[PDB]
Amino acid sequence: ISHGRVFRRLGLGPESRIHLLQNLLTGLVRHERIEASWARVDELRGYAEKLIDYGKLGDTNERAMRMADFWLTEKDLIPKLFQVLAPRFQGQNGGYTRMLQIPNRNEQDRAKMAVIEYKGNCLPPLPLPRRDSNLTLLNQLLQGLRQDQEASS
Amino acid sequence: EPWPIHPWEPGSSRVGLIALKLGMMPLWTKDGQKHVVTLLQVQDCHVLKYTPKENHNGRMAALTVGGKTVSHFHKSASILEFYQELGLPPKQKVKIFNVTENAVIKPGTPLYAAHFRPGQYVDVTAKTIGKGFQGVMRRWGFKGQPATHGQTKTHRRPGAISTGDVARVWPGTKMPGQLGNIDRTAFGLKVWRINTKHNIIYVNGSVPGHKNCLVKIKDSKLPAYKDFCKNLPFPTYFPDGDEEALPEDLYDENVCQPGAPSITFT
Amino acid sequence: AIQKMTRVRVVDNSALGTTPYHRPPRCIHVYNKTGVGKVGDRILLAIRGQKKKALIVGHRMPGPRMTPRFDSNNVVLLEDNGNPVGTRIKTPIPSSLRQREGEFSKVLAIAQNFV
Amino acid sequence: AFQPPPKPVIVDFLSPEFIPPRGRTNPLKFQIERKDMLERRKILHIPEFYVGSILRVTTADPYASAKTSQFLGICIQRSGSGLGATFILRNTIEGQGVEICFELYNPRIQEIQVVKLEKRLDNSLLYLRDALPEYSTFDVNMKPITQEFNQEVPVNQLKVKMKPKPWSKRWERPKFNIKGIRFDLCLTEEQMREAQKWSQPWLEFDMMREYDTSKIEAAIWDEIEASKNS
Amino acid sequence: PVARYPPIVASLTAKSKAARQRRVEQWQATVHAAKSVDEKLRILTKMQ
Ligand SMILES: [Mg+2]
Ligand SMILES: [Mg+2]
Ligand SMILES: [Mg+2]
Ligand SMILES: [Mg+2]
Ligand SMILES: [Mg+2]
Ligand SMILES: [Mg+2]
Ligand SMILES: [Mg+2]
Ligand SMILES: [Mg+2]
Structure with a gap:
């Protein structure tokens, strides 16, 4: 039973998890x-x-x-x-x-990895997933709906 | 376009509600006793579809009630089509209530927590707190073996499970497995307080299921309170029928209200 | 919570409860169907090598709200006829025992302080 | 019947129960409970008192000679959230310590009177059971003491003696964090070093187990002000 | 009212060469704090 738990188990215990998080x-x-x-x-x-x-x-x-x-x-x-x-x-x-x-x-462990970054850093931007442009078909239809809604008021 | 309202009959049954379990509170009685009430909030109760008595059971008709609103983007095409034809946004939990043919209500009708009045007995159905695949000691309550008198790797084992001659185990044998994630119903829960503005019902005793979960509330089917619905509004509570706003909180005849003279014995 | 093999403290002024002994008075059996006794339950004690009856006055386990809790398992000696053998009770007694006066009439008649 | 002329004048808090728990309970329940407890407080005057203060409580007892029952004692601790808040009062009567857990919003309480508003060095002094009876003995017929607001509820820094081991709990463990016990006269250096093995220094700097309630307290105070103006 | 910053010296229990140098400085400071020349020589030559 792990109901209502926000801290996950890492390292060799609570202190080990705290030290690992501190190093990270x-x-x-x-x-x-x-x-x-x-x-x-x-x-x-x-x-x-x-x-x-x-x-x-x-x-x-x-x-x-x-x-x-x-x-x-x-x-x-x-x-x-x-x-x-x-x-x-x-x-x-x-x-x-x-x-x-x-x-x-690429190691044989095939672990699931993430990257964390402080915003406004002096590093090249990551390949962020950008939304589709408004010139797409569905986006243009939604723009037409928005224009109709604006004109209705 | 209201459906015709039929007079209350002794062999009639009323429709239930679908609320949300908020939490637990204390409540003191005028005799000095202290009870524990549970808060059930009726956020969105709506009649979705009506099923005829002959097509559902052949004895009693069935009324479908929806729970609180959910998003359209995560529901199936058929459910979205049904809710589009109904004219209401999708609900989370959809339940069926067995009601008599004289208490039928038109689908699309909303329902309010004022359907239950202070002083009544209700039955609560919900999925209890699912504890997962638990051991036999936590599941069936079997006593364990002694902790340190030499027992080896046995402190929580079930022990013997069957007999030698049978050469098999009976299907009714109690074994570790899934525990908690099943629908249970508590009967005879008394209601003390009804908050109209927030649509809150105060039900005595514990409510099966965790907090912030959907709960199906109906009248008590116990024989002791079979004919308690005579004084209650038979079809449902119509806030527009009376043209009079009910008080914010309706209490029972024994509930010690928050505004009290600090009752003292004599 | 008072059960079997509990060392209790005799409150009422009696020879058994006053004269020292080399073994503290331990419980023998709780007359309640449950093996755990509470305030207002007849209990059996082995005091100074002989059997006796007693009534539970207070226990160190927390109970209902606004119920007094004591630092010792206080008991008052009782006879088989339901009449206390002591003369008077000095330590405070919970007021909840006066709810049932029929069986505790003479027991509460000798009580001085009620809490 | 002469008139007696005294003093010439010649010279020039949020209660703990209102804090909601850390659970994910819906705020509507907290709002309803706060409304109900404010309605109860409108009739029953609940004064300000901390742990270690001395209170007198009047309760409606039907089986006593008089319907009013008075109990005076020091507040061992206060615990609970909302309408179910409780406080423990301890007093030694005739050598027998009695502890009663009263409910703040119980309708059977007639009057709560603070006879000594005073803080102590510990937020929860459960160690009075193992302490000497002198620290738990208090006169029932003592008179209330009134203090100036500028005193800012002075805290009583008193070292309390201890009975010999064993105790009710392991008060020397770091998890209790008790400064009001005179450990240098009751425990030895080896025992003090041994008790330090259960210390968890990372919990003071975890930065995640802390509970921030600034906005919640602000909203609760606004609701209290609105209810008072109502 | 005044910012108080901890020293920027390396760690003591780390595996880094900076930590090793800090430990070397610590034992050299122990030698400095030694009172008698006999104790100083004993500490300086106790390693074999
Ligand atoms: Mg689960
Ligand atoms: Mg066992
Ligand atoms: Mg063995
Ligand atoms: Mg073992
Ligand atoms: Mg072996
Ligand atoms: Mg066979
Ligand atoms: Mg013998
Ligand atoms: Mg203990």
């Missing part, structure tokens, strides 16, 4: 975009979203400072976290990370 978060902060297992990336998405909110609380916040000290193992990233990611994420409320499933790893 440190790598994500350092490189602005990382790729890992799909489950690991999905689990790390929440912590990545929470870290930006903690950083937005200010540099002088002792709780945020000690949280960053615990999580970001590389202490050179804490100033980066408080002076790059937080300042560039101000008007954004919860759109801090992007997660996309990539094809399975």
